[PDB]
Amino acid sequence: VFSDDAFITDWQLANLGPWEKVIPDSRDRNRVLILSNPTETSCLVSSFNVSSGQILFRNVLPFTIDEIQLDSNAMVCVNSSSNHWQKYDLHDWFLLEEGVDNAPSTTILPQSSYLNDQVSIKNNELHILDEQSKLAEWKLELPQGFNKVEYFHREDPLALVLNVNDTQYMGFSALIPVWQRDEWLTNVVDYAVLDVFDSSLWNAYWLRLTTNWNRLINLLKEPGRVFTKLLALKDTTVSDLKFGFAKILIVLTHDGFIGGLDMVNKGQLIWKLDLEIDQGVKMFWTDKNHDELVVFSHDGHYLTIEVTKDQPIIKSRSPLSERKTVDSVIRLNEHDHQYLIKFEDKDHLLFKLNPGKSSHIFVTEHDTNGIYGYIIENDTVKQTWKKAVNSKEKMVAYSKRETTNLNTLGITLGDKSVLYKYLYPNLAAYLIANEEHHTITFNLIDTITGEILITQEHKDSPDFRFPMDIVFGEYWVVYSYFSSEPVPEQKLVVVELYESLTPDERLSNSSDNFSYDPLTGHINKPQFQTKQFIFPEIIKTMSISKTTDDITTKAIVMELENGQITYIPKLLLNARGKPAEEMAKDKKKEFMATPYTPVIPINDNFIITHFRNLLPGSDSQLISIPTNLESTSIICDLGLDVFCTRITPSGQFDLMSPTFEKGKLLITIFVLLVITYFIRPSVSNKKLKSQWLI
Amino acid sequence: SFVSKLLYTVSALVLFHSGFSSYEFHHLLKLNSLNNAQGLPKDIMYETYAGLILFVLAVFTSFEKLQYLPIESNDGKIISQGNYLKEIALNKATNVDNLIGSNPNGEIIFTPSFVDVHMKRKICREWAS
Amino acid sequence: LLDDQLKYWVLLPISIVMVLTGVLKQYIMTLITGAQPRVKLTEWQYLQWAQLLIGNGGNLSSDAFAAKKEFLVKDLTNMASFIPQTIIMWWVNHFFAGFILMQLPFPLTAKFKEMLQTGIICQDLDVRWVSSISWYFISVLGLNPVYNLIGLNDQVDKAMHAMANDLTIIQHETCLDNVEQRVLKQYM
Ligand SMILES: [C][C][C][C][C][C][C][C]C(=O)O[C]([C]OC(=O)[C][C][C][C][C][C][C])[C]OP([O])(=O)O[C][C]N([C])([C])[C]
Ligand SMILES: *[C@@H]1O[C@H](CO)[C@@H](O)[C@H](O)[C@H]1NC(C)=O
Ligand SMILES: *[C@@H]1O[C@H](CO)[C@@H](O)[C@H](O)[C@H]1NC(C)=O
Ligand SMILES: *[C@@H]1O[C@H](CO)[C@@H](O)[C@H](O)[C@H]1NC(C)=O
């Protein structure tokens, strides 16, 4: 099922970042090693074919760039706090040596000095000079922008790299342009999705008849008649536009850069706008009309941008009321056009921008210290409660209840009894990691009032150095953490919430005229059932897929440490499961009751990113975009590498197939037609003329 | 073409036209709803019922009153009962038989083979031979 | 849901195949259809004559009832269901699997969701949305009018001697005596 659309639909882009150092390779002379993308803890060391694009490999090394130097080649990397050091081979990333006592040696990587040696630029034009007898061969007109000459090799495989604009690199050879690269997309912070789509009675009888009959007459000719009747014979662009597959993804990078990526056509760039905000923090649609964007900056400015089919225009820039650094922004009610802005130093500002050209409102903020909650009344914010952790506890994962279209009100059993799943909208789930007992606690807080309603602690020697995560479904919660005691393996835990566990009961949820009041606390309280599963590989992050109507299974989708992305349907993670010995001839169970199966093995069919490397960075997001053709949903991974693809958790049942056997069906119909047409005269003549004996 | 086949062809054309028009109208009530991000009845109905009534009158005007020719005589003299169906009471069935100059018992009455041989030997003698 | 122009290649071929296999079934049952001495057929004929004089001719023979009996006694003494429906279920489950074909206009109950939606592995889709096999489950029942309209159509001696002795005075029918009353009972 994969090999037809293996690389066709997958949408992977490679971003190397702005290059910091370019080291030549002693062997395979048209190859270099690029140190790029610095941060406080690591850097990105890649290998690059210099007479092409075609990044060869990438690795995130946990050393700062100033700690990475050559030998006295062999690329010695030495920590400074300790003396842990690693010597890695060039031309193959082999860990040649490792040690703790002493580094072998270092040499500081030399500065360019490309002036006075090979280059002179006078008349907005670049001349390459021999060292002596400077005859100035291979002159080239400069590009529009020009920052510096990144790399230059003078011997037989001549190659030249220019850092033309701030983020663009141009590569020439013996001079004709050979390749061009752009790393403006190195870190995506927030996204927004833009959709593209198509666009007395007797007089009605006459106009309809005339237009239909003329339409038939015009298409009457152009055998071609049978193929026009066939309706099988095609351009895929109208098919993709009809199902909503084609879309524009609007991304805000970590620096100030908005851009639109074509969700089909392998991510060609439709338009790019360069802001001057110096960091972007969030991005929103201003109104339901989906024409304007509001962009918040780190230093406190906000911008209003008009999105058009052509290159957009930055129609407004202005500061906030208080010029402080912005931590985060929450979108309030759509129609009132409000935003709650949390500044670092933890100060909250209500913001009412423009028209976009008791009815309490409740908010919830979370930190590593706890969950806080707020109430917005009379255009002012007021602290309402607090749930703060102790000195040795630290909250690690938190998730909210996503709004979901309600298709069925209860899960139905075999013998046709129904459990009436628990559907209360104002819930949040979070994990508290406690040292001094080595425990992980799960809490399901009621966010309007602040009741806990569930606590569930695990003591199986959790590690706390390996990533932890939680996701909240329609009526269930699934969280993941690493643990040592049963076996040292990644662990998933799923809890499912029901109104009452007796097979037919609405203990509460009186639905006739009650008009529940949640702020009093009168609501019904849940009951729950929980299970744990073991997974082989370390799960970096998790999400749940979306569709137009939330019918198909939710397909918990996971990004692993490798960068590989794998999903499993929620049907496999079944609470209320049994060990498959007690599932046999248990009439009460379900339709197609899945067994318990605690050990989950990895299935290579479901691994998306079949052969893609997909280094997704340390800070990444998994997002899901619904489409029409409800079997299919789009999933994208944003981060250092941006990637997009389509998944079908329940199989593809709306679109019939790309492998339908039409010819065999027509052959069967034609065989039946001719055998009838040939056997009819025989039976008619023989039996009718013999039975009457005329 | 008399009224029944005319009404069949007209009913078929009208029903196909109304079906295609309803196909078009109901296709662009979901596509147009999707184009707005999930946001011609009367004439079509009257045309559809007109097609239906045409079909029903085409099925009913396919019944013609029974009219006969006499077996004995040779003038037209159409012997019409003014009925649409055939009677179930044996009295009226044999009545409509007797108005024609035939007898349904047929062979038992005439005994065809014996009188056949006698008359075909006779037919050579008579004047028309 | 939003299904995409698979109505034609599923609804039309299935209906065509059911009509054509019905016609073939009728023709094959016609062709397949599902004593040699004269004495054998003669005795069968005399047996049938006794039967009809019991039932048929024992009504209006009022004077002749007595005379006959001496002469009488002196002279006397489901693959069609199983084959094609299984074949069609086999063909439908082979070619048309794992699809949603249409929604019925009337709401069924959930066990019909179990029966009809075998292709799909969802759990809350609907009862009204059906796979392709449902189109067969209706087309079996409702194809009778179409078939009508296209034109289609659908040891020994002792026993009868005992009944000959039984029928002597069993019933002498009151006919050719009351007939004047019944003629005067009508034609008024
Ligand atoms: C096999 C032929 C198909 C027959 C299916 C029945 C069609 C009639 C029908 O829809 O009635 C339904 C069938 O709801 C049920 O499914 C319960 C069945 C009740 C009839 C049982 C007969 C013993 C019940 O009537 P209702 O008023 O409670 O439903 C709401 C109104 N409605 C949306 C239906 C307009
Ligand atoms: C780099 O690209 C050039 C030209 O495309 C090619 O000849 C060379 O083999 C490439 N390097 C490697 C290691 O494949
Ligand atoms: C060197 O080791 C120390 C040990 O605590 C660590 O904190 C530091 O981050 C390491 N150096 C780098 C560059 O990561
Ligand atoms: C750098 O800026 C120039 C001028 O705006 C523009 O061509 C582009 O953004 C960059 N240069 C090139 C050659 O792409």
From Swiss-Prot, chain A:
PANTHER family: ER MEMBRANE PROTEIN COMPLEX SUBUNIT 1 (PTHR21573:SF0). The keyword Nucleotidyltransferase does not apply. It is found in: Endoplasmic reticulum membrane. Pfam families: EMC1_C (PF07774). Belongs to the EMC1 family. GO terms for cellular component: EMC complex; endoplasmic reticulum. Present with 2840 molecules/cell in log phase SD medium. The chain crosses the membrane at residues 659-679. Residues 1-658 are lumenal. Its main location: endoplasmic reticulum. The gene is EMC1. N-glycosylated. It is a single-pass type I membrane protein. Glycans are attached at N49, N79, N165, N378, N509, N513. This is ER membrane protein complex subunit 1. Residues 680-694 are cytoplasmic. It comes from Saccharomyces cerevisiae (strain ATCC 204508 / S288c) (Baker's yeast). Part of the endoplasmic reticulum membrane protein complex (EMC) that enables the energy-independent insertion into endoplasmic reticulum membranes of newly synthesized membrane proteins. Preferentially accommodates proteins with transmembrane domains that are weakly hydrophobic or contain destabilizing features such as charged and aromatic residues. Involved in the cotranslational insertion of multi-pass membrane proteins in which stop-transfer membrane-anchor sequences become ER membrane spanning helices. Component of the ER membrane protein complex (EMC), which is composed of EMC1, EMC2, EMC3, EMC4, EMC5 and EMC6. One of its GO terms (biological process) is phospholipid transport. Keywords: Endoplasmic reticulum, Glycoprotein, Membrane, Signal, Transmembrane, Transmembrane helix.
From Swiss-Prot, chain B:
It is found in: Endoplasmic reticulum membrane. The keyword Endoplasmic reticulum applies. GO terms for biological process: phospholipid metabolic process; phospholipid transport; protein folding in endoplasmic reticulum; protein insertion into ER membrane by stop-transfer membrane-anchor sequence. Residues 1-5, 65-129 are cytoplasmic. Its main location: endoplasmic reticulum. Pfam families: MMgT. It comes from the Eukaryota. GO terms for cellular component: EMC complex; endoplasmic reticulum. Keywords: Endoplasmic reticulum, Membrane, Transmembrane, Transmembrane helix. The chain crosses the membrane at residues 6-26, 44-64. Disulfide bonds: none annotated. It is a multi-pass membrane protein. InterPro entries: EMC_subunit, MMgT. Belongs to the membrane magnesium transporter (TC 1.A.67) family. Component of the ER membrane protein complex (EMC), which is composed of EMC1, EMC2, EMC3, EMC4, EMC5 and EMC6. Part of the endoplasmic reticulum membrane protein complex (EMC) that enables the energy-independent insertion into endoplasmic reticulum membranes of newly synthesized membrane proteins. Preferentially accommodates proteins with transmembrane domains that are weakly hydrophobic or contain destabilizing features such as charged and aromatic residues. Involved in the cotranslational insertion of multi-pass membrane proteins in which stop-transfer membrane-anchor sequences become ER membrane spanning helices. Present with 5240 molecules/cell in log phase SD medium. This is ER membrane protein complex subunit 5. It comes from Saccharomyces cerevisiae (strain ATCC 204508 / S288c) (Baker's yeast).
From Swiss-Prot, chain C:
It is found in: Endoplasmic reticulum membrane. The chain crosses the membrane at residues 9-29, 82-102, 132-152. GO terms for molecular function: protein-folding chaperone binding. One of its GO terms (cellular component) is EMC complex. Pfam families: EMC3_TMCO1. Keywords: Endoplasmic reticulum, Membrane, Transmembrane, Transmembrane helix. It comes from the Eukaryota. Disulfide bonds: none annotated. SMART domains: DUF106. It is a multi-pass membrane protein. GO terms for biological process: phospholipid metabolic process; phospholipid transport; protein folding in endoplasmic reticulum; protein insertion into ER membrane by stop-transfer membrane-anchor sequence. Component of the ER membrane protein complex (EMC), which is composed of EMC1, EMC2, EMC3, EMC4, EMC5 and EMC6. Part of the endoplasmic reticulum membrane protein complex (EMC) that enables the energy-independent insertion into endoplasmic reticulum membranes of newly synthesized membrane proteins. Preferentially accommodates proteins with transmembrane domains that are weakly hydrophobic or contain destabilizing features such as charged and aromatic residues. Involved in the cotranslational insertion of multi-pass membrane proteins in which stop-transfer membrane-anchor sequences become ER membrane spanning helices. Belongs to the EMC3 family. This is ER membrane protein complex subunit 3. The gene is EMC3.
